[PDB]
Design an enzyme around this catalytic site. Structure first.
Site, PDB file in Angstrom:
ATOM      1  N   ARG A  66     -10.730  -7.284  -9.779  1.00 30.01           N
ATOM      2  CA  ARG A  66     -10.538  -6.308  -8.706  1.00 30.01           C
ATOM      3  C   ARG A  66      -9.741  -5.088  -9.145  1.00 30.01           C
ATOM      4  NH1 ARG A  66     -10.831 -11.084  -5.947  1.00 30.01           N
ATOM      5  NH2 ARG A  66     -12.235 -11.128  -4.139  1.00 30.01           N
ATOM      6  N   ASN A  67      -8.893  -5.237 -10.211  1.00 29.71           N
ATOM      7  CA  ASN A  67      -8.028  -4.196 -10.792  1.00 29.71           C
ATOM      8  C   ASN A  67      -8.552  -3.619 -12.097  1.00 29.71           C
ATOM      9  OD1 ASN A  67      -6.283  -4.771  -8.546  1.00 29.71           O
ATOM     10  ND2 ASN A  67      -5.048  -6.113  -9.776  1.00 29.71           N
ATOM     11  N   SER A 124      -1.928   4.846   0.413  1.00 26.78           N
ATOM     12  CA  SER A 124      -3.356   5.132   0.483  1.00 26.78           C
ATOM     13  C   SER A 124      -3.920   5.677  -0.813  1.00 26.78           C
ATOM     14  CB  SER A 124      -3.635   6.116   1.610  1.00 26.78           C
ATOM     15  OG  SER A 124      -2.669   6.031   2.647  1.00 26.78           O
ATOM     16  N   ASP A 147      -3.738  -0.833 -12.654  1.00 21.86           N
ATOM     17  CA  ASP A 147      -2.732  -1.475 -11.807  1.00 21.86           C
ATOM     18  C   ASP A 147      -1.728  -2.318 -12.639  1.00 21.86           C
ATOM     19  OD1 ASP A 147      -3.397  -0.258  -9.252  1.00 21.86           O
ATOM     20  OD2 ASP A 147      -4.736  -1.895  -8.664  1.00 21.86           O
TER      21      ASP A 147
HETATM   22  C1  LIG Z   1      -1.301   1.691 -14.245  1.00 21.64           C
HETATM   23  C2  LIG Z   1      -0.750   2.364 -13.037  1.00 21.64           C
HETATM   24  C3  LIG Z   1      -1.366   2.745 -11.853  1.00 21.64           C
HETATM   25  C4  LIG Z   1      -2.784   2.663 -11.519  1.00 21.64           C
HETATM   26  O1  LIG Z   1      -3.586   2.189 -12.323  1.00 21.64           O
HETATM   27  N1  LIG Z   1      -3.128   3.186 -10.309  1.00 21.64           N
HETATM   28  C5  LIG Z   1      -4.412   3.299  -9.713  1.00 21.64           C
HETATM   29  C6  LIG Z   1      -5.548   2.576 -10.082  1.00 21.64           C
HETATM   30  C7  LIG Z   1      -6.761   2.793  -9.444  1.00 21.64           C
HETATM   31  C8  LIG Z   1      -6.844   3.741  -8.434  1.00 21.64           C
HETATM   32  O2  LIG Z   1      -8.016   4.005  -7.751  1.00 21.64           O
HETATM   33  C9  LIG Z   1      -9.058   4.640  -8.391  1.00 21.64           C
HETATM   34  C10 LIG Z   1      -8.913   5.365  -9.565  1.00 21.64           C
HETATM   35  C11 LIG Z   1     -10.044   5.926 -10.123  1.00 21.64           C
HETATM   36  N2  LIG Z   1     -11.272   5.826  -9.593  1.00 21.64           N
HETATM   37  C12 LIG Z   1     -11.363   5.168  -8.426  1.00 21.64           C
HETATM   38  N3  LIG Z   1     -12.502   4.963  -7.700  1.00 21.64           N
HETATM   39  C13 LIG Z   1     -12.215   4.193  -6.607  1.00 21.64           C
HETATM   40  C14 LIG Z   1     -10.886   3.871  -6.592  1.00 21.64           C
HETATM   41  C15 LIG Z   1     -10.212   3.096  -5.516  1.00 21.64           C
HETATM   42  C16 LIG Z   1     -10.333   3.482  -4.183  1.00 21.64           C
HETATM   43  C17 LIG Z   1      -9.726   2.746  -3.180  1.00 21.64           C
HETATM   44  C18 LIG Z   1      -8.961   1.646  -3.494  1.00 21.64           C
HETATM   45  C19 LIG Z   1      -8.798   1.277  -4.813  1.00 21.64           C
HETATM   46  C20 LIG Z   1      -9.431   1.986  -5.820  1.00 21.64           C
HETATM   47  C21 LIG Z   1     -10.302   4.519  -7.755  1.00 21.64           C
HETATM   48  C22 LIG Z   1      -5.718   4.470  -8.118  1.00 21.64           C
HETATM   49  F1  LIG Z   1      -5.805   5.387  -7.130  1.00 21.64           F
HETATM   50  C23 LIG Z   1      -4.508   4.259  -8.716  1.00 21.64           C
HETATM   51  C24 LIG Z   1      -0.391   3.412 -11.039  1.00 21.64           C
HETATM   52  O3  LIG Z   1      -0.489   3.903  -9.926  1.00 21.64           O
HETATM   53  N4  LIG Z   1       0.794   3.355 -11.758  1.00 21.64           N
HETATM   54  C25 LIG Z   1       1.871   4.277 -11.634  1.00 21.64           C
HETATM   55  C26 LIG Z   1       2.899   4.033 -10.733  1.00 21.64           C
HETATM   56  C27 LIG Z   1       3.987   4.885 -10.668  1.00 21.64           C
HETATM   57  C28 LIG Z   1       4.040   5.940 -11.543  1.00 21.64           C
HETATM   58  F2  LIG Z   1       5.116   6.772 -11.496  1.00 21.64           F
HETATM   59  C29 LIG Z   1       3.055   6.197 -12.466  1.00 21.64           C
HETATM   60  C30 LIG Z   1       1.963   5.349 -12.512  1.00 21.64           C
HETATM   61  N5  LIG Z   1       0.556   2.744 -13.002  1.00 21.64           N
HETATM   62  C31 LIG Z   1       1.654   2.337 -13.887  1.00 21.64           C
END
Ligand SMILES: Cc1c(C(=O)Nc2ccc(Oc3ccnc4[nH]cc(-c5ccccc5)c34)c(F)c2)c(=O)n(-c2ccc(F)cc2)n1C
Length: 276
Positions: free
Chosen positions: A146-147, A24, A160
């Protein structure tokens, strides 16, 4: 080491913004060292086991991303470990992803009609972020609109992305859907920065069409044979020939023939400079 780990006591988890396989995403608050709190996005994850090798691999990945520094690359503020429940903390972005933002712009109540200049500036930002990662030889493997996330100042940043530099045999590779996957990657369990360039072209197309699904009238299962006959995404109605030539160059059969992100970035920057 543990300079990536944030004390859980400094975090307040709020409403769930979205869920998937990976877990989540919640909105939250992070208390900083300076005594002030910051709005954040928290992504809950699942560790394969209660293993030290499993938890160490999570921390090594986090420390790698935490050391990245670019305005067009999403920042990792740190991680929390709440069975151990790992969490990633990123600065919250109210505008969300680029794809939904593009569709909203096509509606009244949504952001005003995005002019071509702004669309090209969205591409330039992604190209800038991709240039950074690929100069460090990092492979994204999930590039789509989307990413891509929009900051409050409207600059786009890449998210992502994977933290590997090379794709190893096949024992998936491209995490994004079939319609963003390069011809060579469909044909073999193979993936390079040039396969990321192919996804960039597809993303440029989603931007130029303002959220349109790639290859209208073509099924997911017929994509490899469709591309194998030399078919590519068609030019949008509202699209400069010079811009179409840039995105088409991303889909050249041979990955060696496709331009690098640094070449693309300059191409796009020059096109943006020439418009009023
Ligand atoms: C580049 C990357 C990750 C990455 O980019 N994650 C990510 C991107 C967007 C996200 O989301 C946001 C962030 C900022 N503002 C936002 N506003 C709305 C959203 C949103 C709400 C609902 C659904 C989708 C998006 C949102 C989020 F949580 C996480 C990530 O997790 N890993 C990662 C893995 C393991 C580790 F040990 C270290 C990092 N890496 C490598």
């Amino acid at each position: 080491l543990e300079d990536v780990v944030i004390d859980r006591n400094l975090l307040i988890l709020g409403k769930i913004l979205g869920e998937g396989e990976f877990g989540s995403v919640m909105e939250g608050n992070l208390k900083q060292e300076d005594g002030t709190s910051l709005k954040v996005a928290v992504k809950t994850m699942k560790l394969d086991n209660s293993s030290q090798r499993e938890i160490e691999e999570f921390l090594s990945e986090a420390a790698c991303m935490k050391d990245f520094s670019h305005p067009n690359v999403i920042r990792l503020l740190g991680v929390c470990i709440e069975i151990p429940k790992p969490m990633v903390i990123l600065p919250f972005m109210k505008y969300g992803d680029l794809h939904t933002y593009l569709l909203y712009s096509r509606l009244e109540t949504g952001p005003k009609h995005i002019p071509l200049q702004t669309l090209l500036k969205f591409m330039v930002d992604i190209a800038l972020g991709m240039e950074y990662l690929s100069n460090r030889n990092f492979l994204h493997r999930d590039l789509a609109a989307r990413n891509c996330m929009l900051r409050d100042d409207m600059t786009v940043c890449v998210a992502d992305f994977g933290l590997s530099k090379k794709i190893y045999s096949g024992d998936r590779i491209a995490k994004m859907p079939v319609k963003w996957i390069a011809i060579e990657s469909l044909a073999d369990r193979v993936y390079t920065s040039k396969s990321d360039v192919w996804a960039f072209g597809v993303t440029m197309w989603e931007i130029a069409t303002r959220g349109m699904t790639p290859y209208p009238g073509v099924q997911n299962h017929e994509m490899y044979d469709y591309l194998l006959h030399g078919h590519r995404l068609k030019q949008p109605e509202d699209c400069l020939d010079e811009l179409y030539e840039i995105m088409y160059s991303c889909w050249r059969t041979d990955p060696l023939d496709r331009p690098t992100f640094s070449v693309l970035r300059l191409q796009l920057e020059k096109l943006l400079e020439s418009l009023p």
